[PDB]
Point group: C4
Chain length 117, copies 4
């Protein structure tokens, strides 16, 4: 049987933009997406450390190096600029592969600077 496992997450990144109109999804610096192994158009869950809200949407790429985290469309009701959020994707696999599965985790410092190790 098949497990759902954490694929990767952006841990405690800060929302940089929030615009109800127009567009939607959560636009994320492509460098951040690569670090966490998250793909453009992949389903993502967003857990807001600042306000406690939890919601699910999908990832789109923002410009590499922009350090952008933009919550757009209806999702803009769920976060504000400055909020600290955790952004996660999940994947499925057989139990055997799940047992030794390792998520990609990206950590942050300062103004959404990616932290090493």
């Amino acid at each position: 049987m098949i497990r759902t496992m954490l694929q990767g997450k952006l841990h405690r990144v800060k929302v940089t933009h929030a615009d109800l109109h127009y567009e939607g999804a959560c636009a994320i610096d492509q460098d951040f997406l690569d670090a966490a192994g998250i793909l453009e158009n992949e389903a993502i869950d967003i857990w807001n450390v600042t306000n406690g809200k939890r919601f699910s949407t999908y990832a789109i790429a923002a410009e590499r190096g922009s350090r952008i985290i933009s919550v757009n469309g209806a999702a803009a009701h769920c976060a504000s600029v400055g909020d600290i959020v955790i952004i996660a994707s999940f994947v499925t696999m057989p139990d055997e592969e799940a047992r030794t599965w390792r998520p990609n985790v990206a950590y942050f410092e300062g103004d959404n600077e990616m932290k090493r190790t």
Copy 2:
């Protein structure tokens, strides 16, 4: 391993009807379903740009050309006539196919007129 990807969405369509009783689900003009690639009886997520609510239900077909978006049953607690919503379906596939996956997106103008390109 297997990714969950955005299959397609109706972007910023307007709710035309909301009836708590009876029936359920979200009835959507079949032309809209075809445009976004969404199937009758497929699980859909609905993100309400107007009121911020997010909920999951399933799609049923409304008459082709009716331009109808009817939120029925318990879902009628989550949207009102006139609300702007995003309606999405998600599918799973191997990582390799996910990397070059392209969602179907349908956009709207005026009174739920589908916008081209």
Copy 3:
């Protein structure tokens, strides 16, 4: 790629019992489970037509013929005796099978009497 489709639902059944302690899940007359094609220990979504709440739990069997719908454990915070709810399960399959997929739907009358056709 793989679609998530409505497998079956109990449409507008009434909650008969709600006990926060102890046990959990939603216990459902086995005849109702068979009618909707829902299995013991299968994940189910519950949409409360009366109070608007939406939550996910799993199905357990109640005695055949009891006409019971018991919301237990934490789920008892989400429904009250007398509430009208829709109980659904979802399954996955290839797109080809999804295109002609037919959900099992069970309808109700009076005191959770299953309605024919």
Copy 4:
């Protein structure tokens, strides 16, 4: 077609720690994880019997024998020390295997002592 089934649960365990900062997820005594068959980095749903909240996160191991249930990061908004929660994982399998599927259930007494049978 493929069913989503309850894999296992921790039934009515008590939250021992809740820290918004830092880390995230829900750290759970590894002995408890083994008992319910839940894996490190597996998606889990948490249903709070005390306050009614329901949320989804992922499991991480706490020290074997610590009897720890720590809700961390954004999840700390959803439970408090002392809350009674049910922690569940779900897996997918073909309908045939689902029909005779048996979830692992772990029960608790006193100060998160695992109860036998």
